[PDB]
């Protein structure tokens, strides 16, 4: 449970699961009872049973012409490693500063702030996507 | 502590004890303090508490109070002993660092006060400022609560008596400085008065000294500060002073109000100290209510200046019973507002005492008929709110059960008329993890089934019986337990109801036990094994080896055993009882092993009966 590094704590617990899974596969492929029994006992013996709290921890909820801004944002979305449909704010910032740099001088700061806003939008969007695929793996 | 309470502990042994408790630091500077885990913390406080009590008991506050009162302090064992007093001063002067140094520094300062009022060095003054600074009042409160959590035997009675004598001397010697802790000290009396032998002593002494002083000032605040006076009165409630408290509330001597501005109908004496009330003031204007408390004309008000106006203590003889009736009418009229929750808190100090009265002397049941009739409508109103103030429902059902202990069918019809509504409290309790509502329901139900409700009356309670048999007993093991013991006591009350019904109903309990989950549940209660029993038995940390959590546990076990005995006598359950458990320990073997139980013969005797 990482308040500040939630995405990590997620991907960690995820691959930790995947490990435990390949493990239990092998172990049942040959034999053991004790460790299985103890994990079970701690998982169900009457305190919210453990796997129940673990479930409970994955949280299930989640100057510019607007439509063209939406198109540009959509072109800067990459499927992050987990299938997170993230808006890459670095590329969006680069392209937005590029559209600014290419009556024009007096509105330069306005377009610059607009670009920074589009970038922050892409950033929060990528963050949402991350968290999405994170809860997905979870 | 007990020996000193039995024979006067001499001052030299007391000085040695203080030095020893100093080296160990009241149990905090332990030579092996490193090995203590969180499961051992209450023991230290125990080692702490006696260290306080032993210091307090060795001071013998009673003889000191009597000597100061009679002008013969030289008869105190501390008068001729200058050296012990000086060395104990040099020792206790360094205290002030831990809460266990609260009481010892106080009484000893009190000691230094009594043995030489004119020879008070700055040492004793610093000691007193420290004791007041150490929150020693809440310290004694928690110490008494813990030491009484073990079913107060001789030991907790001696402890509370020592606390009563010490606090009496405190209230007698420093009348002025204590006023800031009027909350905490109250619980202290509410702690001391929990012993059955204390209330008669409080009622037999003069009212102008000791604990009575705290009562007097408390009377000076009613009915503004309701909860303190009501709690203290409920506390003094014993079998001999029941009617005393009844009459004391029937004749209130002062009525207190907080006034922001001097009303134009208040005519002052020359000194502005004695005011006269010009025209009637109506207390509670709840319409058409027969309990119209009115402070009469010409009545006097003693005016005490408060930073925001005037605290007016008017000499008015308003009946506390009718005033609480009007407050309950207010709760009935305002239940659909938001302050209902807060309202319950202004009411709980009354209802709590009412049961305390009604369950103390049934002969006063009729005299309190107004609140008893209002409680039914109160429950019917406050049980359907989205926020059941669980404690208010609990105290209500408790007073109702105490009323049912004398009039079974009457309370039965009255409560069945209001309605089930208990299911919501049960669900909320299971979700939250405290079961005062369910337990109160169980107590009322047990009294009803035991009060010999006529044959026609048992049919109306059978649904509650099915609820007690099918949903409570089968799952009470899995329900969340916020504290230890409450799950066990829930199961134990369930079994007590079941048995008392079966010891009178019969056919239904038999069928349920023989064909439903209750059979296997009671089987498990029996099959916890004698080893777990004896283990929890060694877990009891005090004299309450006959009154520990293990005692309730063994009671639950013997209850399950007598239950199965009766069930077998009166008739899937048999198959489960003879089945070889899936873990290798056939239940009958666990039963036989109970022959090892050597503390309580009835348990093995009943196991043998089940075996036969």
UniProtKB/TrEMBL annotation, chain A:
Q: What compartments host this protein?
A: Nucleus
Task: State the superkingdom.
Answer: Eukaryota
Q: What's the family?
A: Belongs to the NUP186/NUP192/NUP205 family.
Q: By what name is this protein known?
A: MGC83295 protein
Which species is listed as the source?
Answer: Xenopus laevis
**Record gene name:** nup205.S
Within the intact protein, the region shown is: 1098 to 1280 of 2011
From TrEMBL, chain B:
Q: Which family does it belong to?
A: Belongs to the Nup188 family.
**Sorted alphabetically, which keywords does the UniProt record give?**
mRNA transport, Nuclear pore complex, Nucleus, Protein transport, Translocation, Transport
Q: Which residues form the Nucleoporin Nup188 N-terminal subdomain III domain?
A: 311-612
Quick one: where is this thing mainly located?
nucleus
Q: Name one GO cellular component term.
A: nuclear pore inner ring
Q: Where in the cell is it found?
A: Nucleus, Nuclear pore complex
Q: What is this protein called?
A: Nucleoporin NUP188
What gene makes this protein? Answer: nup188.S
Which positions, given as ranges, span the membrane? none
Organism listed in the record:
Xenopus laevis
Q: Which GO terms describe its biological process?
A: mRNA transport; protein import into nucleus; RNA export from nucleus
Q: Which domain of life is it from?
A: Eukaryota
- Does the keyword section mention Transport? yes
Q: What is the lineage of its organism?
A: Eukaryota, Metazoa, Chordata, Craniata, Vertebrata
Q: Please list the GO terms describing molecular function.
A: structural constituent of nuclear pore
């Amino acid at each position: 449970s990482v308040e500040e590094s939630e995405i990590s704590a997620m991907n960690q617990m995820s691959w930790l699961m995947k490990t435990a899974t390949i493990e239990l596969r092998i172990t049942s492929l040959n034999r053991q009872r004790s460790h299985t029994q103890r994990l079970l006992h701690l998982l169900l013996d009457d305190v919210r049973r453990k796997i129940l709290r673990i479930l409970d921890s994955i949280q299930f909820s989640n100057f510019f012409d607007r439509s063209q801004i939406e198109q540009v944002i959509a072109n800067c979305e990459h499927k992050n490693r987990r299938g997170q449909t993230v808006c890459n704010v670095k590329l969006l910032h680069r392209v937005l500063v590029a559209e600014v740099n290419a009556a024009a001088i007096g509105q330069r700061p306005l377009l610059m702030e607009e670009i920074n806003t589009i970038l922050q939008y892409v950033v929060e969007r990528n963050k949402l996507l991350q968290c999405l695929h994170a809860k997905r793996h979870a | 502590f007990l020996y000193f309470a039995c024979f006067a502990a001499s001052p030299s042994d007391l000085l040695a004890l203080t030095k020893l408790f100093k080296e160990q630091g009241f149990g905090c500077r332990l030579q092996n303090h490193h090995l203590v885990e969180p499961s051992m913390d209450p023991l230290v406080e125990r080692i702490g508490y006696f260290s306080i009590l032993i210091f307090l008991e060795a001071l013998d506050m009673d003889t000191l109070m009597t000597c100061s009162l009679s002008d013969k302090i030289e008869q105190h064992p501390f008068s001729s002993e200058e050296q012990v007093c000086k060395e104990m001063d040099s020792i206790l002067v360094t205290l002030g660092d831990v809460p266990h140094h609260g009481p010892v520094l106080l009484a000893w300062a009190l000691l230094r006060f009594t043995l030489n009022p004119d020879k008070v060095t700055s040492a004793v003054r610093k000691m007193g400022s420290t004791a007041i600074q150490l929150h020693l009042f809440q310290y004694l409160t928690r110490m008494l609560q813990s030491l009484r959590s073990g079913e107060n035997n001789c030991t907790t009675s001696t402890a509370c008596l020592c606390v009563y004598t010490f606090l009496a001397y405190v209230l007698s010697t420093l009348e002025e400085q204590v006023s800031q802790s009027q909350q905490d000290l109250v619980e202290t009396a509410c702690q001391v008065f929990a012993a059955p032998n204390l209330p008669d002593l409080f009622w037999n002494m003069e009212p102008t000294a000791g604990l009575g002083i705290l009562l007097d000032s408390v009377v000076g605040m009613f009915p503004f500060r309701i909860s303190p006076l009501l709690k203290l009165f409920t506390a003094l409630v014993s079998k001999s002073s029941a009617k005393k408290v009844y009459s004391f509330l029937d004749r209130m001597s002062s009525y207190t109000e907080h006034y922001r501005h001097k009303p134009h109908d208040i005519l002052s004496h020359d000194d502005e100290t004695l005011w006269k009330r010009q025209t009637p003031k109506l207390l509670y204007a709840l319409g058409l209510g027969q309990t119209n408390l009115r402070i009469p004309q010409g009545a006097l008000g003693q005016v005490m200046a408060d930073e925001n106006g005037f605290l007016v203590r008017w000499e008015y003889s308003y009946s506390c019973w009718t005033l609480f009736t009007c407050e309950i009418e207010m709760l009935l009229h305002v239940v659909s507002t938001a302050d209902v929750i807060h309202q319950c808190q202004r009411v709980k100090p009354i209802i709590d005492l009412v049961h305390k009265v009604i369950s103390t002397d049934l002969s006063i049941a009729d005299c309190l008929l107004p609140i008893t009739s209002r409680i039914y409508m109160l429950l019917q109103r406050l049980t359907t709110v989205m926020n059941p103030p669980m404690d208010f429902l609990s105290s209500c059902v408790d007073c109702l059960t105490a009323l049912a202990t004398r009039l079974p069918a009457k309370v039965w019809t009255d409560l069945r008329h209001t309605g089930g509504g208990y299911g919501s409290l049960f669900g909320i309790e299971q979700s939250q993890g405290e079961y005062s509502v369910t337990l109160s329901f169980l107590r009322l139900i047990t009294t009803l089934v035991k009060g010999q409700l006529g044959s026609t009356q048992s049919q109306g309670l059978v649904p509650c019986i099915l609820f007690v048999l099918r949903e409570m007993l089968p799952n009470y093991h899995r329900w969340r337990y916020n504290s230890h013991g409450v799950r066990e006591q829930l199961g134990f009350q369930i079994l007590s109801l079941i048995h008392a019904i079966l010891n009178l109903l019969r056919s239904l309990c038999i069928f349920s036990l023989t064909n439903t989950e209750a059979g296997q549940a009671v089987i498990n209660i029996m099959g916890i094994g004698v080893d777990t029993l004896n283990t929890v038995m060694l877990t009891q940390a005090g004299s309450s080896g006959t009154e520990g959590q293990g005692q309730m546990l063994m009671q639950t076990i013997k209850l399950a055993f007598s239950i199965t005995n009766n069930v077998i006598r009166l008739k899937p359950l048999e198959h489960a009882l003879t089945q070889h458990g899936a873990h290798g320990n056939n239940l009958i073997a666990v039963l036989a092993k109970y022959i090892y139980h050597r503390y309580d013969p009835s348990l093995p005797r009943l196991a043998i009966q089940l075996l036969k």
